[PDB]
Design a protein around this ligand. Structure first.
Ligand code: CL
Ligand code: CL
Ligand code: CL
Ligand code: CL
Ligand code: CL
Length: 394
């Protein structure tokens, strides 16, 4: 260590080599402009939550940290208000409800943003005359069409069911149109206050069971692995799958003749609009009590400069959080086509106690394996919801 420098500690949930390497390159560029700062960048991976929990309890936070979809709920008491920073004038308005309170606090700087729906093979849908589905009913009808017309040669909706998170993603994304987006058919208040009736969730298990029974998902869903997806998609073997984020670009590298697109998550209730799911992905929040708060803010401002924000966003394959930055990403075409579609945060992060992600994955895998029936799943979910609320409380 150089004792003529002070250390600025930054925690990140970034996972890929492109993300980590680009963040390090930008940290090095920051250091060129600030000869007295050594940036200490940490990527704790699976240990992130445990380490931040202990650091919060110790009142010993990193100077900058990633809130990764939990900005208000988990980090509200520790974050510096960023409302007086210059970059806030360009915050994507789709992020206002997620990264601000109505009373004006800006909780964190969004490096990027997540917008998840369904990924699909454009050519397959054109072969069979299928328009992008905007409702669950139209989605299922498309799956039936693909099964009928392909005579079983194309998987209509593919799951890597070996990994329970594949089913969790299904439940989590579709819980938003089911329970959140429609003012006449939502349960926001009941979810937050513990009175939610899990009988209202059964619909999603019924749909999944319909897809299984009707051979609209892959026959091998219980044993299919994430590592198989790119090759199968590039071989024109899959019509739809839940969005993973880099599928199109990865497939194009192997077979440029296959064009993968994305669409928003279909709506469920009549008259409701399709929705993008995500919002926060990676953020930089400053610890309000950091002795190096000024430097932390200088680093955020540096990251928010358009050339830097574009670079970082592109490494993550997602749009920037700022309107003055147009990251050249693979799905940019589709995000422009769907520019007026709204964004909802991930259901589990806002509406369920911590721990429910794994439970959603569990029950979906047990459904696919014919261990649990839809009615019994909702009862298990309710029990875990109650238990995990009781534990997060006490
Ligand atoms: Cl965390
Ligand atoms: Cl897997
Ligand atoms: Cl994707
Ligand atoms: Cl962008
Ligand atoms: Cl979990």
């Amino acid at each position: 260590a150089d004792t003529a420098k002070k250390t600025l500690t930054i925690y990140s949930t970034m996972s890929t080599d492109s993300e980590r390497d680009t963040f390090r390159k930008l940290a090095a560029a920051f250091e060129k402009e600030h000869s007295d700062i050594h940036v200490s960048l940490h990527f704790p991976g699976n240990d992130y939550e445990n380490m931040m929990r202990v650091r919060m309890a110790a009142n010993d936070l990193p100077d900058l940290f990633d809130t990764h979809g939990w900005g208000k709920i988990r980090y509200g008491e520790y974050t510096a208000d960023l409302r007086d920073m210059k970059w806030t004038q360009d915050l994507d308005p789709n992020l206002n409800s997620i990264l601000k309170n109505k009373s004006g606090k800006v909780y964190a700087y969004p490096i990027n943003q997540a917008k998840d729906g369904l990924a699909y093979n454009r050519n397959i849908l054109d072969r069979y005359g299928i328009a992008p589905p905007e409702t669950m009913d139209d989605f299922i009808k498309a799956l039936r069409t693909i099964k009928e017309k392909s005579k079983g040669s194309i998987v209509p909706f593919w799951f890597a069911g070996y990994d329970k998170s594949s089913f969790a993603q299904y439940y989590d994304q579709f819980a938003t149109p089911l329970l959140i987006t429609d003012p006449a058919h939502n349960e926001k208040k009941q979810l937050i206050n513990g009175t939610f009736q899990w009988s209202k969730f059964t619909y999603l298990s019924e749909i999944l069971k319909q897809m299984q029974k009707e051979k609209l998902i892959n026959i091998d869903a219980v044993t299919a692995k994430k590592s198989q997806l790119i090759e199968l998609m590039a071989q024109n073997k899959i019509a739809f799958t839940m969005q993973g984020g880099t599928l199109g670009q990865d497939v194009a590298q192997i077979n440029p003749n296959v064009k993968v697109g994305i669409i928003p998550t279909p709506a469920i209730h009549p008259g409701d609009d399709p929705i993008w799911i995500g919002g926060e992905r990676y953020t930089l929040a400053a610890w309000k009590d950091s002795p190096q708060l000024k430097e932390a803010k200088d680093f955020i401002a540096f990251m928010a400069r358009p050339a830097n924000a574009k670079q970082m966003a592109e490494a993550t394959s997602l749009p920037s959080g700022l309107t003055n930055v147009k990251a050249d990403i693979f799905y940019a075409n589709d995000y422009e086509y769907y520019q007026d579609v709204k964004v909802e945060p991930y259901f589990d992060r806002l509406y369920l106690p911590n721990g429910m992600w794994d439970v959603l994955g569990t029950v979906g895998q047990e459904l696919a394996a014919d261990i649990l029936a839809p009615q019994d799943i909702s009862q298990k979910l309710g029990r875990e919801y109650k238990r995990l609320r009781e534990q997060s409380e006490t």
